[PDB]
């Protein structure tokens, strides 16, 4: 049975520390996202891109140079992912023990984690109709993205597919902060030098995640197991994503890379 002891208290303070750091590193939280998507906010109502005409108006009145709509959209998506890498790295630094690891191992974890965490944070921004863009100034429908010419038409479909089932689990920001920390501290990334210290931090994050989910989700006694199955799903999902990022690169031709 479960007891409120010094050990459970320390896992709750670790959970709270990650939440606080999460809120700091990620400007747009799932709570705020869900308020915008459900019209349960006083904040400015986002501009809806549902067709080519509403895209053209949207570019002029979103305020975020290829002559193809499809390429301009994909470029915005890739620029936002660079920004997401920076936010996720900043978050990684807040995880107790992470800045103490071999810098090269710090890089490897982030290098192989960021795509998996980007799919996760995209679900927070999605409902059945589409995805919030431009830090919640815009909303782009799933069916409009799907109408873009090959190979851009299929770019966002697997993120939507993941998000529909991931969102059904009804995680909140407190669950997600720990979930994302478990992903980053994955001891099985290729090329890691010193595995055990990563598994040691991960063990602690897994205990914290399990407790968070028991306290926060009385409706699913095996939510912990289901979340580990999603980390497993995300691995092959990122495989397919990285695959398509190539097919684009060699078939179709950010200021911090230029610097």
């Amino acid at each position: 049975h479960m007891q409120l002891n010094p050990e459970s208290a320390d896992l709750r303070a670790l959970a709270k520390h990650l939440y606080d750091s999460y809120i700091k590193s990620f400007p747009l939280t799932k709570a705020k996202a869900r308020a915008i998507l459900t019209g349960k906010t006083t904040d400015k109502s986002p501009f809806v891109i549902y067709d080519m005409n509403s895209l053209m108006m949207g570019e002029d009145k979103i305020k975020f140079q290829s002559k193809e709509v499809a390429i301009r959209i994909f470029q915005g998506c890739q620029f936002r992912s660079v920004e997401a890498v920076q936010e996720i790295t900043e978050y990684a630094k807040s995880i107790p023990g992470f800045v103490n690891l071999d810098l090269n191992d710090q890089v490897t974890l982030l290098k192989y984690g960021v795509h998996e965490i980007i799919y996760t944070m995209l679900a927070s921004l999605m409902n059945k109709d589409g995805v919030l863009i431009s830090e919640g100034q815009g909303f782009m429908t799933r069916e409009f993205l799907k109408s873009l010419r090959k190979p851009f038409g299929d770019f966002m479909e697997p993120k939507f597919e993941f998000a529909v089932k991931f969102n059904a689990l009804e995680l909140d920001d407190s669950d997600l902060a720990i979930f994302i920390a478990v992903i980053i501290l994955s001891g099985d990334r290729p090329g890691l030098l010193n595995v055990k210290p990563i598994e040691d931090i991960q063990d602690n994050l897994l205990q914290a995640l399990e407790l968070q989910l028991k306290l926060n989700h009385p409706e699913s006694s095996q939510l912990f197991a289901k979340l580990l199955q999603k980390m497993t799903d995300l691995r092959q999902i990122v495989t397919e994503h990285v695959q398509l990022l190539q097919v684009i690169k060699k078939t179709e031709t950010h200021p911090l890379l230029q610097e």
Binding site: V82, V85, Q86, T89, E90, K93, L103, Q106, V107, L110, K111, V114, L256, L257
Partner: peptide
Amino acid sequence: GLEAIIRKALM
């Protein structure tokens, strides 16, 4: 590319 951004962000 990806490593470049992570390393500079990690500073």
